[PDB]
């Protein structure tokens, strides 16, 4: 069986705070075949070589993909501060991983969303007189608790979202502010490929 | 004896005028001063002066220069002509710019007509103007302008300017622009009036207009939908002439986004640090944010651990809004006036990331304002001297030992000067002292290094010689005791006042929250004529609700306006009548705005103390006034808050009791503040219950009735009403 | 006497009520009257009454029935409730149809709420009502409504109802519906107000209303864009339940399509012939059309040979509009009232095909109206008796003789009755005579056959027994001769009037075009109180411009409103005071509407004769009033017509002369006629000059100031002003 | 040879006040053919039999045609009053004439105009006060002076047209009101056939 990457190439891609995550087990891949479908503008790896990533047998292969404008490529760099690293996406380095910033030409079948969008603020309100503001940052490779506020883009820049939280979700009032970025000429994407190894269960070998 | 009295025509025609010494500090040792229409630059230490701009360098314009504004570097002067007043601070005019170096008028890229606001940068010659509710920036006075905003929409979106409610009750200014200390960043506010209801009234204009205009102003009344606010900062140096400018948004803290909130203060600390003060709609909880700039990304950063919370359990926060901070040079600490555990306002010392602050002043008095801050001394104004809440004096306190406080103005001329204000130079090397009374105003100049008086700038001795020909009234500032608490009053006593003779008394009233009508300020007003010519005692009284005396006296009328402030005015008039110089059968009361509300509520109380009364543009129902002011003291007119007190405190409910008094109601048709609706509902209540009363409308006049013709007409009409009620010839 | 007098409370609380007898003729011998809240039927021949509809039959409807209308066949009664007033005649309400003989309330296909108008056919039980500016017709009170028009738009297109300028100054009514005699055709006009500007004023309403309300009504001021009018006639017998109704339009004559014009009169003649009067915007030219129904094409054809031109070269056409025709029973001739070349309005007999008419009446007097037309006689009201224009008497002329005129009312009680009103029955079988003065109102019933005064309906003797023990003032009606012409005055004299003692003089004035303030009508008014209690002489004067004295006197003010009719009241005061019994230092003047304009012009005329004056809702500048009224006497405010006098006649021109008189200015804030703008511009001119005066506004009150509480307040206030000005304790 | 009967049955018919006139000389006509092409409802002739006019020798054979509603047939009669005879069309009776009011079959290559239309009023407003209204009637077989106002129908019933009259027509201003009548299931036409003789050996024969 072959690992198909269809949801990366069909439909409309999600925002950075709502990134889709594909996990592949017991299948075969052609990594270079997918990078050919895009005009890559950055392919930085950590823990694995940009060549060996396409030739290795893996226990599992996970890919986080999302729409991401090239103008904000510095906010996704390793060790970067800002809104992207705090309330949207932060790359995990627990496993060997590669970071891809690619532009999709019109040759592909995926459609451009209305605009780009990230979260400016995602904090919790609680305490006496609702006075305690605890900003809700994300661990690397996790979702913001503000993702359910707008799961298909922001209507306008500076959108304010508020909603009461359950006790499992911590409690208090969740406040979020969204930022809207204009859509570019072509579609610009962001791919985070990470690799997990096993003691003896590498069954995501490449295709030859 | 044979001398002349201060007549009504003297007050109306400004026969006797107070000379002032208005200076503009351009440096640490030089200031600008206009004399005989010539702009002079003075050296503070020595006193020598030079001409900066002649009284004839603008005589060939054909225009009448209404106002001017010289740039901080002195290279340009902004000329303002064709002035049309809007509200209390807003207006519109045209603007010519004059290059002082080239000695010619800037004619390239002129400032457009109908410009709403213009402001220089605090240093240099950068310009930011608002036109069609959009902000534009000129780096040089004759270069093209960069357009910062494109969302400007009349009566909908305001960029760099305020709407009515923010201009009137929050910022007390039309401007919503805040430059950085050295002109790098321009911070501005945006207001969205989409769902704000509109007040509508007729404007009749000149006789030639056949059909009246209908003025529509977004005006949020009590409980109505309020405007929303956003805050942005833009770098005025990275402005490209080929790409639109970028503005970074500073969002309100999360504890404010959970509901309706306001933006109540903008204070720049360093060149890369700005402090915002936000306030909930329930104005007993404000939060101060501290935001720093980083050039790595280009955006701002407000640490949560740097927020500060000023809240009140006895009432609202601040006197009218939270006080503004005064930051140290590095911007890592500041001094702010807040209420202590006893309800007195003193100076607290904050660390930007330390929630606890240290009070550096204490006592049964209040700090009015922080005026200057050096590396060693903190200057402020307080009402501590001789325990008089109506006096003002300049104090300095040592920052190394808070026990070392020194008064710089208490003993200068203590019988003539008891109300001081100060103007410090840059870096606080010199300071001008401005004495307001009770004597004639006195202006002196001093140096901070040794607190040495340099010279006298203006002593008003020219007016003094003129005022000795006229029998002027005196002024008594004393206090009475109610429920074991001192309450201060003042009285304008007629000339040759006789303790054995009885006089008619007119009670002047405002009695609003944090008001003070009993002070040591010298004033040439209507009360001067009523005392000098008509031998009428004019008294004012600061009861419960008045400020500068602690929160227990001030936050007493919280959620109950129209109660203790009305009762205490009546109680004061009772105590004034027990004195032996007051005809207890000829006592009147008159007021404006809140004073009109108090006068009307007093006249409808049934106390039988007052014979007549005049109410000028009075508030009649607190659901008719704007939301920011009313909800600050009353709350939301909802069944779950304070609607019951909203309806218990109307003038209309007291209509039957007006059968005991002679009532005069005056209001202008074009009042955007206290709408004519309010007096229209008073007169309707008096008619439906059988009460006769005198009335007077003023066509197309605002809340001030301040047109020359109208201002003379109302004070002449009010004078005859008093002279007939007091049976005066 | 030497006891009770007519006091201000007697006039305000209606202590001395005048009984009236208001009947509704149902047939030629049966009339309806309401007594003890029981609607009855009085047989005119026997006088035997009968219960038509009692009171307790509606004690279960759960609504306040405001009025009622019985269909001409007596089978249905129209109950009106939820009455909400608009202007002088307009109002919307809810309606229900109660069947009489079935005694069941009709519940199917009810009249919708907010119905603007409703009218029965003159014969039968067919209904036509207007709703949402659209006409509906119910052939039977229990069947679905037939919709005639579909172009109804609020404040834009009016179907079957009048706009403001037509309701007020043209038709004097709200209805633009006209049934054909036997119910077949329904003629209706259509008004278009698209390009008519709107007057805007504020309505503050109840205290509960937070934001005031802006009222906007299309109001054509002097020289503005007038509305346009179309005419339609629909056959109410061929209505289809499956097809939309079709309306045939009748076009104005070609002499009216070349400019602005008005449809000013609609009068059915036969049942297939209708007469339409049209008037040019310059109201010096009117032409009457006569249109017959064409069965072949279904249209209506008006021939030019049937057109009658009624124009004038020294003034306008008619008193306020051209007179209506009174046709004979076959529709080939009619009777109209027109000037008689010497200026006196008499009856002319017309042939519908001959443009020339012959005057059947002549003399130095005027016919007031045509009341009934029989196959043999023609009854009219006139002022011919004893040559007094202030009197009204019923006359009878023979269709054959034209020289056998019989005073049917004169000398029936000549000492008590000199002002008559007649109400004929169907076929003019009987008629009721209503005597309005100088004595108490007297109601008599007669029979047209042989002038048989068969019954006396109301002698008002109950009011006479009360008025004996009160000191009623007398009423003198006489005249003076100025410029060789006779001008009439009238005076109300204090009781026990001594011919030698000096008296205060209040000069009541309206002085409008074609007005008459000196008549023989008995009134219990405010002037009765001022003469009975305060012993003030109340006087009026009909001068140049007053009506009913020939078009010579009336047309003296053409294109000169504010000249002659003002100086008449001034010079008359010279004639009044020179009579010897008037205090030549206590002369006042007071007026309403046009009379307020005259009072204002007199007080600012510098005549030095009047001491004080009151002006209630006065006209100030003729360019502020509506077009139909003003342009009738002033023309158009263009530099080509009479603009020079439009500007030469404003009250604001005379502002500096009000420094010599006391002035009381009263105006209601919701006046739809004389807008508050008029008084607001008067006060603004007096303030800008330096004139003190008294002012009083009445919130949400209209041109009448006739609310129960407001009416008592304005007359109490004017009583205090008059008593003070005359120094009367 | 063959007379061109075709212009009557192509396109949209003109209105009454805008009638078109076909004059025929030196041709052969088949009048019995054209009457059958329509559903004739009136064949009124004066000075000649309706059968005699389909078979005769004439010098000129003129035909005036227009769109005319059958409901208005009372106003196209001789000596009739009404707006049709006064301001639109008055039949000339100087020569033998026939009058045919016919409805057309469903498909006759003739278009139904938006609605029928005639003038209701056509007067000269003049005088020292613009007070004398002088109605302007037409001569038989002539065109009204109001024809130019809107020669191809009216937008709706009651359209008031205004223009100034030159010194050639004298007076002041010409005003004219139009009238609109809805279109029925089919369109209804109207023809006035006039024939003349003269001693030119004739020329127009069957
Ligand atoms: C009431 O009167 C108004 C005009 O005072 C009528 O509205 C007018 O309707 C006509 C018909 O379409 C329009 O006038 C003309 O329309 C053409 C477009 O077809 C335009 O190009 C011209 O410039 C001209 O405007 C227009 O919509 C409108 N004119 C206005 C409002 O000035 C209305 O139909 C009348 N209502 C009735 C008779 O019920
Ligand atoms: C501001 O004042 C309001 C009203 O005086 C107070 O809000 C009350 O808060 C308590 C506890 O949160 C509630 O139980 C009450 O119902 C609230 N009052 C009303 C009228 O709703 C409170 O003192 C202040 N609120 C803050 C946030 O400081
Ligand atoms: C000003 O505020 C209004 C009201 O919130 C904004 O208009 C809203 O915009 C979006 C459009 O889908 C929705 O939230 C509402 O449908 C709109 N409301 C109304 C009343 O139109 C508007 O966008 C704001 N303007 C700015 C410049 O912020
Ligand atoms: C993988 O993709 C590359 C594209 O360059 C292609 O050359 C190669 O044959 C592919 N291998 C497969 C399909 O096994
Ligand atoms: C005052 O005198 C000093 C002496 O040199 C001079 O430098 C300075 O410019 C003078 N200041 C003014 C304001 O004239
Ligand atoms: C009154 O007279 C009329 C005459 O028609 C008669 O019908 C009616 O019954 C009479 N009513 C009484 C109460 O006599
Ligand atoms: C009067 O009513 C009758 C009903 O019988 C009707 O036929 C007739 O047309 C009407 N008269 C008119 C319309 O002149
Ligand atoms: C004329 O028309 C008639 C129609 O019936 C036809 O019979 C005849 O043949 C025609 N004659 C011609 C076309 O010459």
Numbering used by the authors:
A (entry chain D): 389 to 596
B (entry chain C), C (entry chain A): 38 to 766
D (entry chain B): 389 to 594
The publication says:
To understand the mechanism of MjHKU4r-CoV-1 entry into cells, we determined the crystal structures of the receptor binding domain (RBD) of MjHKU4r-CoV-1 spike protein bound to human DPP4 (hDPP4) and Malayan pangolin DPP4 (MjDPP4), respectively. MjHKU4r-CoV-1 RBD is composed of a core structure and an external domain. The structure of hDPP4 or MjDPP4 consists of a α/β hydrolase domain and an eight-bladed β propeller domain.
The overall hDPP4-binding mode of MjHKU4r-CoV-1 RBD is similar to that of MERS-CoV RBD. As expected, the footprint of MjHKU4r-CoV-1 RBD on hDPP4 largely overlaps with those of MERS-CoV RBD and Ty-BatCoV-HKU4 RBD. The RBD residue D471 only forms a salt bridge interaction with hDPP4 R336. H517N mutation on MjHKU4r-CoV-1 RBD significantly reduced protein binding and MjHKU4r-CoV-1 pseudovirus infection, as this mutation would likely break the hydrogen bonding between the side chain of H517 and the NAG linked to N321 of hDPP4.
